[PDB]
Design a protein around this ligand. Structure first.
Ligand SMILES: *[C@@H]1O[C@H](CO)[C@@H](O[C@@H]2O[C@H](CO)[C@@H](O[C@@H]3O[C@H](CO)[C@@H](O)[C@H](O)[C@@H]3O)[C@H](O)[C@H]2NC(C)=O)[C@H](O)[C@H]1NC(C)=O
Ligand SMILES: O=C(O)[C@@H]1C[C@@H](C2CCCCC2)CN1C(=O)CP(=O)(O)CCCCc1ccccc1
Ligand SMILES: [Zn+2]
Length: 585
């Protein structure tokens, strides 16, 4: 047979394999927004009904050769139907336990309807009572972590079996194989080192001021930071305390909260301003199928659902939905853009076959939305839209401008790095089950300098307390994002004439790229490829480079770096930390 002959058959397998994706995807959405035993029994069926399809599509099998092997990645479909159900069953048992968790208020046993979103999320983000933050910290982990230890161990062994039947060493080889570059696990390690001098200086700064506020008894000047004081359950972002520990408080903030309240903001209003951005870039306009079938507010009926913001692609055409329990605050506003970046990416490669209907690599997907967040963060873009007015950006302000960006986005790179670095150690057998917990906190202490609020033990199993852990969702994507999103932001700040390496008062940190079609067109082209071309090619269409480069982000925070170096010295603050003793064996 000729080239077209083999291609004439794949297209017949493209659709047949693409329909059961939507069936399995739609059934996954039902259980995603309506946690019911009935919906779980239907999600796993469409999955099993799908695995039967992928299993058969494999044996039945330049662009061509890619498809013949890009459509056969079983994933977990290599296991027998009984083990396939057993794997997804253990996973859902963790995600279910994660989204259904409810808690009793601190000091009130009669009120026991508190949930992660909104109560717990906003308690940590705004309460400055240590004993309270600690109480909710233990309650959250003892409820979402250890109770699913047994289900997790089952999920691991089957994830490893699937990796073997797919011809791989362990689960780690799978997630890494997604980036298709044996020299990538080492690339990441290199970038973290390039970031360590900056993060530690910022870490020391935060710790000292956290010691100012709460006192020395609660914050050791030489030990890791109690993570429950960083305004976030997982300490992945410290934005919720940026104002609480700001360099110069007698300055203008960038909360953009009350001015969202004053101007009567609604969850739908926010998403509109997001659609308003992509359109200005000559990109896709948010369709109506999204306005209808999406969930942009926590349902006030009482069902059980996964409030963890997400964006879905049911394949087919133009059916894009976002499930986010939105609230009125600046933090949520950026969460929207991250989800919209996922929706946009769907609309760009929807004209591709089922194989190439995905981002170049997991990093691109997560990065898209945050790239706009970089421009929105700027006062320039916030000043255009009333949210930000009378903002006399001084030199100090630009420090707070660089500071917030650090405690918000910089501290997240070490966090995202440790997550997958740990799971890889569990898949590769480097972490025995008898030491699951204290090896996790050992990494969190080493690479982020934060420790639990109370002494944990191996009886506890805290990793599942993170959504992505209980849901089996790779997190390195979020790390790669925070590295490439500055490269994209760079090549997008240059095509909008908003960045020239050296530009004094036209900084790469104040680069607002609204109404830039040239940047959009080039962005549309990269997203259009999806998984059609290797990610180096997609990497080049927009950035011009073909490798992940920390030069962008390193240039972003260098102004903050120089102020921390000079400031930590004067403040007489300690840098670095001793090992954490908050986990015993
Ligand atoms: C969350 O999922 C559950 C599934 O366990 C949904 O229950 C289902 O609700 C629909 C109606 O929304 C039921 O269909 C109805 O059947 C009656 C006859 O009994 C018919 O007259 C109605 O026109 C409608 O077709 C369905 O039977 C029911 N399934 C089960 C197993 O109870 C629930 O509605 C979902 N929640 C939300 C908020 O969507
Ligand atoms: O909160 C977190 O932990 C991270 C970081 C944060 C992000 C946006 C705000 C600014 C900081 C970075 C938000 N988020 C997300 O995972 C949101 P998603 O759309 O990727 C959610 C991706 C998971 C999709 C899924 C759902 C069900 C089954 C399988 C897969
Ligand atoms: Zn994402």
């Amino acid at each position: 047979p000729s080239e077209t002959e083999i291609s004439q058959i794949v297209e017949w397998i493209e659709q047949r394999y693409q329909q059961t994706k939507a069936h399995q995807t739609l059934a996954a959405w039902e259980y995603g927004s309506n946690l019911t035993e009935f919906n779980l029994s239907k999600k796993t069926k469409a999955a099993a009904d799908f695995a039967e399809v992928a299993k058969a599509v494999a044996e039945e099998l330049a662009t061509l050769k890619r498809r013949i092997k890009k459509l056969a990645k079983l994933g977990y479909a290599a296991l027998p139907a009984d083990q396939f159900k057993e794997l997804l069953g253990a996973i859902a048992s963790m995600e279910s336990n994660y989204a259904k968790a409810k808690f009793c208020a601190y000091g009130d046993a009669t009120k026991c309807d508190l949930s992660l979103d909104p109560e717990l999320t906003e308690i940590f983000a705004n309460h400055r009572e240590p004993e309270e933050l600690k109480y909710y910290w233990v309650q959250w982990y003892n409820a979402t972590g250890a109770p699913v230890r047994e289900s997790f161990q089952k999920y691991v062994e089957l994830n490893r079996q699937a990796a073997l039947r797919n011809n791989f060493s362990s689960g780690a080889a799978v997630w890494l194989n997604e980036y298709d570059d044996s020299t990538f696990e080492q690339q990441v390690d290199d970038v973290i080192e390039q970031i360590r001098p900056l993060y530690e200086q910022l870490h020391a700064y935060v710790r000292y001021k956290l010691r100012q506020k709460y006192g020395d008894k609660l914050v050791s000047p030489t030990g890791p930071i109690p993570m429950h004081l960083l305004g976030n359950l997982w300490a992945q972002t410290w934005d919720n305390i940026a104002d609480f520990t700001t360099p110069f408080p007698e300055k203008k903030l960038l909360d953009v909260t009350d001015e969202m309240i004053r101007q009567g903001y609604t969850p739908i209003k926010m998403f509109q301003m997001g659609d308003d951005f992509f359109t200005s870039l000559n990109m896709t306009k948010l369709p109506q199928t999204f306005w209808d079938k999406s969930i942009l507010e926590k349902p006030t009926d009482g069902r059980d659902l996964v409030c963890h913001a997400s964006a879905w692609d049911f394949f087919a055409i133009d059916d894009v939905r976002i499930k986010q329990c939105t609230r009125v605050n600046m933090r949520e506003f950026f969460v929207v853009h991250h989800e919209l970046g996922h929706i946009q990416y769907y609309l760009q490669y929807q004209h591709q076959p089922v194989e190439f209907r995905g981002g170049a690599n997991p990093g691109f997907h997560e990065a898209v939305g945050d790239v706009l967040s970089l421009s929105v963060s700027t006062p320039k873009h916030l000043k255009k839209v009333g949210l930000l007015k009378d903002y006399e950006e001084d030199e100090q302000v630009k420090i707070n401008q660089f500071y917030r960006a650090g405690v918000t986005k910089l501290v997240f790179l070490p966090f995202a790095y440790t997550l997958d670095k740990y799971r890889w150690g569990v898949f590769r057998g480097d972490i025995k089950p008898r030491e699951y917990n204290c090896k996790f906190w050992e990494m969190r202490s080493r690479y982020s300098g934060v420790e639990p609020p109370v002494v944990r033990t191996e009886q506890d199993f805290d990793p599942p307390a993170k959504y992505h852990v209980s849901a089996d969702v790779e997190y390195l994507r979020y790390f790669v994002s925070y590295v490439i999103q500055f490269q994209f932001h760079r090549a997008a700040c240059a095509l909008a004439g908003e960045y020239v390496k050296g530009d004094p008062e036209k900084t790469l940190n104040n680069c607002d790229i609204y109404q830039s079609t040239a940047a959009g067109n080039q962005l549309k082209e990269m997203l259009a490829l999806g998984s059609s071309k290797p990610w180096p090619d997609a990497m080049e269409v927009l950035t011009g480079e073909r490798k992940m480069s920390a030069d962008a982000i390193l240039e972003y925070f260098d102004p903050l770096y120089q102020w921390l170096l000079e400031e930590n010295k004067r403040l007489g603050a300690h840098v670095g930390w001793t090992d954490s003793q908050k986990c015993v064996s």
